[PDB]
Amino acid sequence: VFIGGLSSLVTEDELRAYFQPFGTIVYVKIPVGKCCGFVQYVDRLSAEAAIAGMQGFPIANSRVRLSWGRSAKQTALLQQAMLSNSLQVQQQQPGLQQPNYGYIPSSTCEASSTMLPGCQILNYSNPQQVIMQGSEAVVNSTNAMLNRLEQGSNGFMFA
Amino acid sequence: ALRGLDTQFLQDNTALVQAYRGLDWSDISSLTQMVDVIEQTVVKYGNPNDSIKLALETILWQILRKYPLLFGFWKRFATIEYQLFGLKKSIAVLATSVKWFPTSLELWCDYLNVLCVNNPNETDFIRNNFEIAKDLIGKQFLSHPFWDKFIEFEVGQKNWHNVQRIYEYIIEVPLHQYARFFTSYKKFLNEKNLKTTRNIDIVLRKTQTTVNEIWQFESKIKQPFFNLGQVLNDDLENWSRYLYHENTWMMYIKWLTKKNISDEVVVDIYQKANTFLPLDFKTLRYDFLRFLKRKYRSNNTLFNNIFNETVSRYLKIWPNDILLMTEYLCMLKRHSFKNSLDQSPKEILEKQTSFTKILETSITNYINNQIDAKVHLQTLINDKNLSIVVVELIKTTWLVLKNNMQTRKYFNLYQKNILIKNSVPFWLTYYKFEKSNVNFTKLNKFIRELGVEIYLPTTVMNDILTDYKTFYLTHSNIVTYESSIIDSNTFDPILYPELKMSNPKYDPVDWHKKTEWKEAGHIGITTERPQISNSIIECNSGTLIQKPISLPNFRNLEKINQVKINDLYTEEFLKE
Amino acid sequence: DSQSNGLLNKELFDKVWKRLSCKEKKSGQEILLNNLVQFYSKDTVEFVEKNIFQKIIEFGWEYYLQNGMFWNCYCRLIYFDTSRSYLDKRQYIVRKIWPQIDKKFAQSVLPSLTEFCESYFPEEMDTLEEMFT
Secondary structure (H helix, E strand, O other): OEEEOOOOOOOHHHHHHHHOOOOOEEEEEOOOOOOEEEEEEOOHHHHHHHHHHOOOOOEOOEOOEEEOOOOHHHHHHHHHHHHOOOOOOOOOOOOOOOOOOOOOOOOOOOOOOOOOOOOOOEEEOOOOOEEEOOOOHHHHHHHHHHHHHHHHHHOOOOO | OOHHHHHHHHHHHHHHHHHHOOOOHHHHHHHHHHHHHHHHHOOOOHHHHHHHHHHHHHOOOHHHHHHHHHHHHHOOOOOHHHHHHHHHHHHOOOOOHHHHHHHHHHHHHHHHOOOOOOHHHHHHHHHHHHHOOOHHHHHHHHHHHHOOOOOOHHHHHHHHHHHOOOOOOOOHHHHHHHHHHHHHHHHHHHHHHHHHHOOOOOOOOHHHHOHHHHHHHHHHHHOOOOOOHHHHHHHHHHHHHHOOOHHHHHHHHHHHHHHOOOHHHHHHHHHHHHHHOOOOOOOHHHHHHHHHHHHHHHHOOHHHHHHHHHHHHHHHHOOOOOHHHHHHHHHHHHHOOOOOOOOOHHHHHHHHHHHHHHHHHHHHHHHOOOOOOOOHHHHHOOOOOHHHHHHHHHHHHHHOOOOHHHHHHHHHHHHOOHHHHOOHHHHHHHHHHHHHOOOOHHHHHHHHHOOOOOOOOHHHHHHHHHHHHHHHHHHOOHHHHHHHOEOOOOEOOOOHHHHOOOOOOOOOOOOOOOHHHHOOOOOOEEOOOOEEOOOOOOOOHHHHOOOOOOOOOEEOOOOOOOOEEOOHHHHHHHOO | OOOOOOOOOHHHHHHHHHHHOOOOOOOOHHHHHHHHHOOOOHHHHHHHHHHHHHHHHHHOOHHHHHOHHHHHHHHHHHHOOOOOOHHHHHHHHHHHHHHHOOHHHHHHHHHHHHHHHHHHOOOOHHHHHHHOO
8 A cells, every 4th residue: 555645754653553453564664755655464455444444544634645556676666667668567466375264354463273264263473474363362452452552651652 | 885986986086186286275175075074974994094094195194194094993993904004104203102102002902902813913013012112011012912812823922932031931830821822712713713714804795794704703702701701802893893783783782791891881882883883773772772771870970961962862863753752851850850758748849840840841932932952851852752741741740749720721722732632642641631530521522533633543543442442331330321322423432432443534424426436346446337327126026017117317328438547656656 | 429339349349359369270360450450539449459459469479479560550550549649659659569579570570660660750760770679
């Protein structure tokens, strides 16, 4: 997702805090002085939900216009290719190699299992590896939420 | 920086000097400025130091050539070229040579004599000792280098033993012990010395860092602790810094921490890392600040000044960072305003009142833009770090002075400021205040405005909604809930936090011109979709049989092949 | 003050304490403690302290005693009280609570305790680090 119109008062940590609850994130970057960033989700569903929900939502007093974009390497390749105006050819982003059975897209994990359909058998580590989701994840999520609500009020993190 | 760029700049300077054809004072000044710029933009490597020294020598400036060389030698223990140039310049010197050169020679021997590339330094020291008539100084210098491990350690020991005519066997047992220790150290070191001479070279890469040689040196320094560690650490650090490497810096600093050396040396090493390391690493600097915070107790006076200087520099280089501000506030309130439980409460409260007053004056003056350079807080304050200072003021007023009316006044006054309106710590402390008071009217208004007027990060919004749902469920009753329910806005403090869980612009309060309909199936691509104005698919056939069905009325048929895209990425980023 | 007894009614307090009695088998010990802290009034904090924190202190359960978040919860419960004056609550914390903990738990209790000290008690931080040598 290409986020444009940033106010330059926002950093990578705060932008990740903004765009975390819509899904898991591969990487978040903000080019220096370019007033725009990128958020690389894992799920297409997560990216679509983020675009649908965060549109015109003002980060640092400046309204934000979301649209699809590309990666960093692809960005540099496209810039050099339009400077040389040679080809302007893109490559499709890699797929998930269907079928995948463990995963449920648009799901969150932070930190036995009978592999029954109701739960989420597999999930993605928060940055990256693959860990088997357990029943203690709901406890850990609330624990971390209370931790960052107590500490964030004192002011150790704006996230 | 770039070796090719540096070579091109040197070639351009040489061409300009050649084309000047005169004394060219302006060209000399330009060359000096270029050399200073190269030194300040690069690591001030041995090649640039030697080039600057050669230029100064050609311009007949011995003092100027030594000064850059002295700076590069004190700023780099492995500055072999700088040390050699300094020795060559000090070979012919004034009467003060006997005091100046010996101190630098002793510093070099204590810093890098145990390195394999220290042969020229030892030779220069031996030549100076032989030329001088200070027999005791020469013997001490020979003894200092005779116990160090070098490549030509046997040759150095033999030379010392053959030159020691008046002190051949003054301490026969110490001499034999030193010779045996030096021989064993050289024999053990030879493998790593060869593996470094085949891999250790500054090229700014992995082969330049020489991972195998560095691992061998680290193993020989950690496992084989032969009590020579006090010099082996500097000897290994020379090659380690010959590579910047964050992990190597952490390893080295942890190693002196395990040594528990005196505070000024580790402080100096932290400062050297702060200078040499480039910006945007944010790890060694925070480690250094935390080290100052923990070791402050020892001195209580010098560490305060060091902390203030470091925080000023860090907040000047990182305008948007915030943890620096809370660390500075904690340091200031801990040192400058010292409280203790033994002394009287009336005296204690005066410090808190003065703290509230200084915070209030600084905030008001910065809002009205009248900076006062006398107070360090006002000049150190920043536009991103204003909400933290005001929230600290709120916290002190509400908790210590226990002035609820004034706390509410401060909230009302500084809520409307655009500069601190959409901040996380301020609104979280407001939430903690309106939770310490049980009142639910303010909290309901707050979580109703959480999507409209108060723009907070969605993670913090989720946390606030969950915690408020739990707090309400635990501390309210059905009578209060029913009184709080109003159906005009469909707001209910039990279900509304669940519905607004992840939708920031969720509002409780013709469907073909809207963006949601225009890009239903595909997001980011807006296309007008053809449709029938009077569609009868809703009606059942049973009531359709009533009357003859009208012909269709159409809409957006010419637009089935024209599809438009708002290419924001290409428009605003590639074309900028 | 119409402070409704949320978790301090004998029907629910029995269940909460019964779950707290397992002390390693369950998962929500810290969440229960932190959600039990929030009462913010004289009599209610007196009851909560005497019934939960004092009783655990006297029982000496090592799991809860070495968990620094428990001590953070206790200090936070006392410090946010709207009845005590600032000097009274600072005196109470510094001279009662901290001496009650054992020194062998320092390496585990120090993080959260120092986090609370940096946030609210910058002046007493010297006393904390001196006592915890």
